[PDB]
Design a protein around this ligand. Structure first.
Ligand SMILES: Nc1nc2c(ncn2[C@@H]2O[C@H](COP(=O)(O)OP(=O)(O)NP(=O)(O)O)[C@@H](O)[C@H]2O)c(=O)[nH]1
Ligand SMILES: [Mg+2]
Ligand SMILES: [Mg+2]
Length: 154
């Protein structure tokens, strides 16, 4: 019986929740692909564990949350506040494993949310901010592993 870390993908429509999930799961990225709980056995810091990712459309059983927004849409960034508030209430826990993810970092020329703005919010919530790209793979494994580490340590 291996540890099972339950991760939940949250965020506005189109931010890349599915793309991130599929890149992490199968190392595949197909632009314009609109997809089905995904499971995968991985080694976290020397320990084989199982990660379970719930990729919902833009929640109580979840142990950790990846709060995703697109750096190219400030609207999706603004929306993270509601998602944040909703998670804490439903989960009743204020220190729930949470990570703010700014996806689509490869679309820098279309950025609407600066790194400093996102970081400010992350610091305000006492969580980390990581920018990812399902397309270039940049930091995708990092956000899932980092979140599992959060879950691992309560
Ligand atoms: N260039 C680029 N495109 C991305 C990235 N992540 C996702 N996309 C693209 O953005 C679009 C929406 O991604 P998708 O994963 O479907 O978003 P979602 O958050 O899962 N949408 P929904 O909430 O409706 O389920 C797709 O055409 C996808 O290829 C990224 O990092 N870079
Ligand atoms: Mg999706
Ligand atoms: Mg960059």
């Amino acid at each position: 019986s291996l540890a099972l870390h339950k991760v939940i993908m949250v965020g506005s429509g189109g931010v890349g929740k599915s793309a991130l999930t599929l890149q992490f799961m199968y190392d595949e990225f197909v632009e314009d692909y609109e997809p089905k709980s995904y499971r995968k056995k991985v080694v976290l810091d020397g320990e084989e564990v199982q990660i379970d990712i719930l990729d919902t459309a833009g929640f109580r059983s979840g142990e950790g949350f990846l709060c995703v927004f697109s750096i190219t849409e400030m609207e999706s960034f603004a929306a993270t506040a509601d998602f944040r508030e909703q998670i804490l209430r439903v989960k009743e826990d204020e220190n729930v494993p949470f990570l703010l993810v700014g996806n689509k970092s490869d679309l820098e020329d279309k950025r609407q949310v600066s790194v400093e703005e996102a970081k400010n919010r992350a610091d305000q919530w006492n969580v980390n901010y990581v920018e990812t790209s399902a397309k270039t793979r940049a930091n995708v494994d990092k956000v899932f592993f980092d979140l599992m580490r959060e879950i691992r340590a309560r």
